[PDB]
Amino acid sequence: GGMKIYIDTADVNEVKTLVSYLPIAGVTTNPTIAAKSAVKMDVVLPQLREALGHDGLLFAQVISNDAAEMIEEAKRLHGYVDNLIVKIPVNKEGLKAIKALKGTNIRTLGTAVYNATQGLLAGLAGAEFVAPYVNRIDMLSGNGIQTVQSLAKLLALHAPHCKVFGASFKNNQQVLDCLQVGCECVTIPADLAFKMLDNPAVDAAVEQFQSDWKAAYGRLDI
Amino acid sequence: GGMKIYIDTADVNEVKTLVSYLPIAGVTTNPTIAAKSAVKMDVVLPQLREALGHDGLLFAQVISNDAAEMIEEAKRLHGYVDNLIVKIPVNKEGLKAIKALKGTNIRTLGTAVYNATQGLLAGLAGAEFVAPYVNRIDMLSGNGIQTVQSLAKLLALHAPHCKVFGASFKNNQQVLDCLQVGCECVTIPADLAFKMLDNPAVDAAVEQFQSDWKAAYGRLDI
Amino acid sequence: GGMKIYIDTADVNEVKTLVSYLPIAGVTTNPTIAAKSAVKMDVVLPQLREALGHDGLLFAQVISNDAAEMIEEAKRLHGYVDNLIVKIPVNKEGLKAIKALKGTNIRTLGTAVYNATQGLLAGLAGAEFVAPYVNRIDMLSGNGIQTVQSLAKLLALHAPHCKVFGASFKNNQQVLDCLQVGCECVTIPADLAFKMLDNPAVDAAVEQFQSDWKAAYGRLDI
Amino acid sequence: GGGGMKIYIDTADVNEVKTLVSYLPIAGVTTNPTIAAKSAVKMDVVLPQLREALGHDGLLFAQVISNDAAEMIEEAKRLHGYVDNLIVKIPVNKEGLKAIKALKGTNIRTLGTAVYNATQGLLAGLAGAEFVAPYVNRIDMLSGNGIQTVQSLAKLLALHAPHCKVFGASFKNNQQVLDCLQVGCECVTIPADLAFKMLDNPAVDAAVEQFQSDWKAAYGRLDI
Amino acid sequence: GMKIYIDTADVNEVKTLVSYLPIAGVTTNPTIAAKSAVKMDVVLPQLREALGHDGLLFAQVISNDAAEMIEEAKRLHGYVDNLIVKIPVNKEGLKAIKALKGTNIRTLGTAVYNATQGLLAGLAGAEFVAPYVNRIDMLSGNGIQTVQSLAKLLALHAPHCKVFGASFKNNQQVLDCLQVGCECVTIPADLAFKMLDNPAVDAAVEQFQSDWKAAYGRLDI
Amino acid sequence: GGMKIYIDTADVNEVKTLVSYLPIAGVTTNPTIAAKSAVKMDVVLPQLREALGHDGLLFAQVISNDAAEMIEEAKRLHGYVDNLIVKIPVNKEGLKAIKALKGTNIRTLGTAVYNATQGLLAGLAGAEFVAPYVNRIDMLSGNGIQTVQSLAKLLALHAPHCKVFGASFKNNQQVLDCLQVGCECVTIPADLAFKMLDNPAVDAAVEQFQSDWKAAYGRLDI
Amino acid sequence: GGMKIYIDTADVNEVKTLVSYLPIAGVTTNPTIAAKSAVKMDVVLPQLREALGHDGLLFAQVISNDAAEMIEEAKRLHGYVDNLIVKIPVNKEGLKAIKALKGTNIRTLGTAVYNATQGLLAGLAGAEFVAPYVNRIDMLSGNGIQTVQSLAKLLALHAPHCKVFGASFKNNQQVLDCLQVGCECVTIPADLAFKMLDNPAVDAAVEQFQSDWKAAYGRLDI
Amino acid sequence: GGGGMKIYIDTADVNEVKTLVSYLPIAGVTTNPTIAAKSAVKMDVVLPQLREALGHDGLLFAQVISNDAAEMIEEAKRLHGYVDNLIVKIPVNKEGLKAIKALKGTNIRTLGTAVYNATQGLLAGLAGAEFVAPYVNRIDMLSGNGIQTVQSLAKLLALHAPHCKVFGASFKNNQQVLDCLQVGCECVTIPADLAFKMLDNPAVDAAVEQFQSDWKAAYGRLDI
Amino acid sequence: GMKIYIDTADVNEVKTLVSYLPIAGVTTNPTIAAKSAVKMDVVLPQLREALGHDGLLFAQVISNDAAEMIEEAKRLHGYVDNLIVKIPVNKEGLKAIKALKGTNIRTLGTAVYNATQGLLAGLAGAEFVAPYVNRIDMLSGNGIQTVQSLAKLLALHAPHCKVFGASFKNNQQVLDCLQVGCECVTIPADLAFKMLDNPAVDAAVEQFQSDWKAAYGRLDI
After folding, report:
1. Among C174, E60, E143, F49, which is disulfide-ready with E137 (CB 3.0 to 4.6 Å)?
2. Measured between CB atoms, does F144 come within 8 Å of chain C?
3. Secondary structure of residue G80 in the 3-state scheme
4. Residue E115's Cα: distance from chain center in Å?
């Protein structure tokens, strides 16, 4: 349905700028990015929905290490804005929160995925999305794309209600590879989104098109 | 639907000659091609429709660098003839125009595509076609067919309303490879279309056929 | 339906012999083979129909070099027998005749195909079949099976109403490879058809069976 | 579903059929002139015995001997009348293809045997044969491409003669049998000596001994 | 969601693992049960209770003759509801699988070392077959290849039977089996306890809360 | 050493014509080929040596089925001309003759090879060459090139004194594939050798070259 | 030695311009390119030698259709400049001239190569190089790189004194693929040579470097 | 042998060079106009400082700025005289290829930088460059074939210009660096931020903690 | 013949394995040594004696700081002849490897989880690097691929360093490492005891002597 490219930021101005010319599907956040803006979640989240311009999905992450405390924070985040999915780190306490929140109206995402094992367990526990850190896996074991491919294949066979949500990217080739091996969508950092379209070949092709047009018509009109 | 082989020219005589013996689906133009004929678009587009002989799709490209001007030029091009698709370069300003023209009856094509990134973004923005420059990509990075194959798979998975439209060819095998890796249709320059069926082996086989027919019947009658 | 193995000949006696033990789908002809028999087409075609034993497809080829004359020859050939498909060489003039014969009751086959370019153009023009000369391609460029495989894919994707009709064979593996890579049917020369089942290992096994059966039961009875 | 008709036994020995069908999921019995001649019992007598030894109404397979097509047809009718659910095996040569052609549309289903290449199997399938049986191990002996021949033949039939399936034959080890069933064979027929050794795996016996050795050490006996 | 089974007789380990892992059921074998040395007719109701839901339970026969395997299968099946009896795939095991087919006692063919015994068990009526992946890797080095071939053979020729991966020593064997055609897997408890502890995840989580305290003050949200 | 392309004929005129423009390494014969010319071996072998123009290898084949007679026929064939290699069929009796002729100056070639088994046994028995019938193997089992590739690797590993000598060809690509998978040399029928360089594209390119040379210089002088 | 990139032209000014910044190994010519310049060979060849700047190899092609005349034209061409190799079309008459010119001081190149058969025959005949028309092969059969790869292997195995000289190119990837699959050297048209280094991404990176250096040091000095 | 000259650091910060070279096997320092402009220290001053911070006589890399070939040659001579063992980086364009041509045979070794395809790298190698540096991550950004470009370029140089080696540059993770070194790169240069995080592996810290936790439990302390 | 090493501190297990297996030497780590709880300066001479030849012995440091790693490396190296000191490849471990390079104390880089730390250790002067194959399979599932890449990287860029396979759970992991570029491997004792016991070999041997008794009478030859 076109909900494919998400932006990983907490700055409202960057969302309004990028959504004005890019098909942005929504905004994702994490405790580090939210801490950079130094703005409380119950205020910046309504500002990110307004900046987006459409009814796209928003993502916010819990911070507590206790499962019973993750569930409390998940309910508060779900009430801060509309169409919000709670991000839960896939660990022992994280799966408890994903398990308890299964069946309710609070959709969850299993984040901080570093291997296909934790991604599959989160999908079986009731998570709608799992988010592997592609570039961090490349740093630690050098098989980021292979992990995304294996995880997406495992979910399609054994837990089809859970899709892979690509995260942690440093270049366009990583983003496209994930979408090509089974990801349902991806989230990209702001600096990557601004550098996505600058292709010097396109600018050189347009300036040659306009140069030929002026030589044959004397103007830039059509 | 038999709408596969498009011709890339603004020369009316070349359109009439090729469509008489080839299954031509339509005509594509770019500012450089249109400037070669140097006849205004509001005049040459009705001539190309008449020369085509059927209601096949026609393709014209905007000239301006400003997004607001591209939208104005796209609406004027759409009114010059029927069944015309506006070609828009996939840059930052061009993606604004594709975003604004989505939903309208002004179907758009994302041209000047050099990588699968801009092609995917154009399809998600609302473009009906995306046109990678196969031979120009072979010049800059040497992965023209690979770019087409990746972009076609990405669209089939994440933006099925958009298709890949092969462009920029220098030999027959580039054309066949694009159609083999997932292209919906191709547009070829006129000089290439005149050399496609040129096969000396076929002429030798046809000559040998009728030569053996004379030796047995003394005539070319059947 | 079992219409897979066609025979390329004009000898009426050879058809009666081979159809006696082989599932022959029909008979194909060409000007060179028809010239060897030195028999007029209006006489040999009704003979081949009766020799075939069923209403299988027959194939006859035009001989003129101009489209307006290929059409006239195709109409007279279509009136000599029932269930006849006209073979037309895939060149500039041949594509004009296929274009004009499209929509009529006269079905056409594109012959003298040496590459996938002319095979695809003939299929898009309205030809029901296209016939690559496999062994002749192996002689000139050495990619006969690869050409058939590519052409079969291109038709399935872009012109599914046209099928590949394998022709020009010298051994059994060429025939079987064509049927395995997408050929709807094949035509083989009569010399190949008489040598298809020639397998000394089969005859040696049957002789061993009869030898053991005579050693036990003292007879060849059962 | 599947039907379960997958493993056939290639023998004419009644005692072996009874023993193997008692614990193995046997689908039927196949014979050939060499195998039937070893038992030295006439076909009108051994075929009813094999049907009784099989214990169910599985398919039986018997082969003609004559070289003449008209005599093959007469032998095929007599074999089809010796027992119920019998498929006649016919060698895939010129005269055998005549018999397969004449027997199509009748109530006598045929199998194309003595297949050494994919050309024989494809022609037999187009001629009207319900099954074709390549001799896998004999092909490996002559040209070393037994599995490749089976895979090509099964693919050619699936695309061009879907009413004909491949029937794997002539095997010497379990790997050949499993490869054929994996590359497109509908079913296989195995010799008796192979069927008796299919399950022989000393690793399984060692695991079973270890399981009960641990059970005796902890509970004192083998009670559960 | 019936994908991950636990291979143990430790009721306490089942209660701990089920509190945070999506456990489908519990499998046992003679060695695992004998280690705890708890009688089957008591531990099986305990496993059903500890599991928390009505998932499948698996218990294995021990005798060598088919007649006693049937007697043991009938007793095991009566100890708890929804129990599948594991039977080693040998000649006597194939007789017991055949005799039980058509009754309410479903069977699993265990101690599978090649695809031949797996296919014969499926054709004989077994609902599952369980190759010993790590033990095959020890003897012939083709554990995953055997599982892959067996899964495809069953899908083509015995679709009522499916492959049940067993005998694992690392997470990668488990994920390979689930990718090459396994319907489900059973993993030992020690492996299940080591599945989730990932040092990179812990470091990433602590870095998140460390940045949160520095920008706001504490773990408030 | 440039001894790669051999010709398979007993026709002296065909040897003279081909060697005048082709790098022919020698002449090979078999009982069927020699019977086509029907001139005795002790007479035709000196004629083929003269027609060849150089001291290239000649190949003659024994006729008898008895091993002792093959050895007598091999010694007589060796005395008819110089640089002659005796072709012996690789059967049970033929392997006796190869075993007995090992060590002598009567170099032997193992012919009538249909699988890598008999070829390997012939090389281990003392044969200098082994000749598989590529096109006949393609007829019987459809693995002609695979048989050649396996036999060449087996000899290079276990009997390096023996090489594979490609034979029985029906098109150019079979010849090139054999030389590409490890054949030392090939022998082709005369009809194929006359059709090798026959390429209509080359004639069209040469015609276009001199045609453009006339338009600029008015002559074909340089 | 650095003799890899040759230029296919007869324009003396273009050689002086391209050799000023490119490692040009030499200049190749053909009758069609030589006809465009309309300059006699005895004059342009000494001009191209001085324009090249070093004693690199020059290439000139014969024009006659008979071998006895190709030899005479090859001798006169060899006497116009130093270090010249004569290009000869690989046909029946061309192989006679290569055969006769073998052993002499006149080195030959086999041109107009459309398949590996004629490339191998020319190498075995005594040609130092063979030149496949890559782009023309891609037009007729679509296996230009595959043909070059096969020919390079066949020569390395069976005629190692002959190398493959890639010719007829339309983009950079065709050239690089040929050098990667076994081409000793390549020749490119002048239009391709002037467009080789055209990369807008390189120019955009150099402009960014100078922009940052002016922001820090206030100058472009260092 | 190997020589050990494999890992280069891409920075102009003297403090980072000292810190990283103290525990990492650093071969040298590479610079570019953007990196050098961040330090805002003139090249005749920072290059002697980087040589001192490196601690050994490793190779240093500095790049020209001018667009004119004759000015590039003058800038290359001044850079070569600022420190010892300095290789001049020159962009691979038309004017840069003129400078590489003129600088061959002299005592000034050159590197071909700003390489986005294999055509630039091959021409620079034939022109006389000792190294060529493709921007891996920038190629991935533009055409998504960074590693493929490096592998093709290294193969083309090994076959046609063996005096020129590939120098991997522009990296964002360890996987890109290792891929380049595995597909044919002679050496790589990495940013400072990447070099500081190369060894970060929480799995290693967990294994070390477990080793000493087992050691304390058995011996009482961490004595050995 | 210096290919198979045993990962144990059990002197008795070394004496048993060396009696029939071609053992090249003995490797230890803190966990394996602490289990037996025998002091290093005593067990290392015992391992040298039990080995029977002068093969390499391996012992690992335990401190966190490089300065104390050097002190522990000097003490370990003095406990027996031909001892290589294992050092974890982290920032402090790389300092100790660098400080020991050029001395008579050769080092091995252990606790290797990716090819990056393996290559840096080789460039820093380590004679061996030891990836944890089974532990990598647990965390990222690419243990053999990591060993293969690391072996090729060292052959190209640090040829003085070689890969030393460690952390195994079946024979197939061991053979895969030796095929993708490992110079040698170290295997736990339990794996070494289970390498040779093959039920098919025992059945084949007993069938040979059963046919021999039936034809002659007894095991006479």
Report:
1. E143
2. yes
3. coil
4. 18
Q: Say if CB H165 and CB H124 are below 8 A apart.
A: no
Q: Which residues pair with F132 in a beta bridge?
A: F113
Q: What is the CA radius of gyration of chain F?
A: 20
Angle made by CA atoms E146, E152, E153, in degrees to the nearest 5: 85
Cβ of I75 and H224 within 8 Å? yes
Whole-Å CA distances, G219 to D63, G214, G222, H84, H95: 97, 5, 8, 25, 20
H115 token code pair: 């390489």
Dist CA A114 CA A136 (whole Å)? 8
Beta strands in D41-123 (DSSP E): 60-63, 86-91, 110-115
Other C-beta atoms closer than 10 Å to the C-beta of C73 total 21
> In chain H, which among 1-20 make CB contacts under 8 A with chain I?
1-2, 4, 6-7
* Cα–Cα dist B202/C118, whole Å: 10
Which of E20, E174, E221 lies nearest to residue A92, judging by beta carbons? E20
Look at E113 and D177 and tell me if their CB atoms are within 8 Å: no
Sequential DSSP letters for chain I:
---EEEE---HHHHHHHHTTS---EEE--HHHHHHHT--HHHHHHHHHHHH-S---EEEE---SSHHHHHHHHHHHHHHSSSEEEEEE-SHHHHHHHHHHTTSS--EEEEEE-SHHHHHHHHHHT-SEEEEBHHHHHHHTS-HHHHHHHHHHHHHHH-TT-EEEEB--SSHHHHHHHHHTT-SEEEEEHHHHHTSS--HHHHHHHHHHHHHHHHHTSSS--
The structure was resolved to a resolution in Å of 2.1
Q: Which two tokens stand for residue H87?
A: 């290789």
- Three-state DSSP class for residue A133: strand
Strands (E), D120-221: 131-134, 165-168, 187-191
Rounded Cα gap, residues I28 and D58, in angstroms: 63
Cα distance between residue I150 and residue G135, in whole Å: 41
Helix (H, G, I), strand (E, B) or coil at G180: helix
The helix or strand, by DSSP H or E, that contains position F166, with its residue range, turns out to be strand F163-166
Q: Closest partner residue to E175 among I134, I141, I175, by Cβ?
A: I141
CA-angle at E198, arms to E197 and E204, nearest 5°: 125
Shortest CA distance to I143 belongs to which of I132, I151, I154? I132
Q: What does each C-alpha distance from I75 to B163, H161, I30, I128 come to in angstroms?
A: 70, 52, 15, 20
Minimum Cα–Cα distance from C197: chain F residue? F140
Cβ–Cβ under 8 Å, residues D216 and E96: no
Q: Does C137 touch chain G (CB under 8 A)?
A: yes
Q: Tell which residue, B129, B33, G196, has the closest CA to residue A208.
A: B33
The amino acid occupying position E22 is P
Can you tell me the distance from the alpha carbon of C105 to that of E23, in angstroms, rounded to the nearest whole number? Answer: 67
User: Is the CB of residue I196 less than 8 Å away from at least one CB of chain D?
Assistant: no
The SS3 call for residue A160 is: coil
Sign of CA dihedral F198, F200, F202, F208: positive
- C-alpha distances in Å from residue I219, one per residue of A117, H34, I199, I210, I215: 55, 85, 21, 9, 10
Any CB–CB contact under 8 A between H182 and chain B? no
In angstroms, rounded to a whole number, what is the distance separating the alpha carbons of residues I185 and I195?
14
> Smallest Cβ distance to G22: which of H91, H118, H123?
H123
Q: Residue B190 phi/psi, 5° resolution? A: -65, -40
Q: Judge: G138–B173 Cβ closer than 8 Å, yes or no.
A: yes
Q: Does D34 touch chain C (CB under 8 A)?
A: yes
Q: Catalytic residue at C87? A: yes
The answer to whether the beta carbons of residues D182 and E148 sit under 8 Å apart is no
Q: Are E112 and E130 in contact (CB under 8 A)?
A: yes
- Two tokens, residue H108: 């000034």
How far is residue H148's CA from residue H138's CA, in Å, rounded to a whole number?
A: 13
Q: Distance between CA atoms of I153 and F68, rounded to whole angstroms? A: 62
Q: Which residues of H participate in catalysis according to the annotation?
A: 89
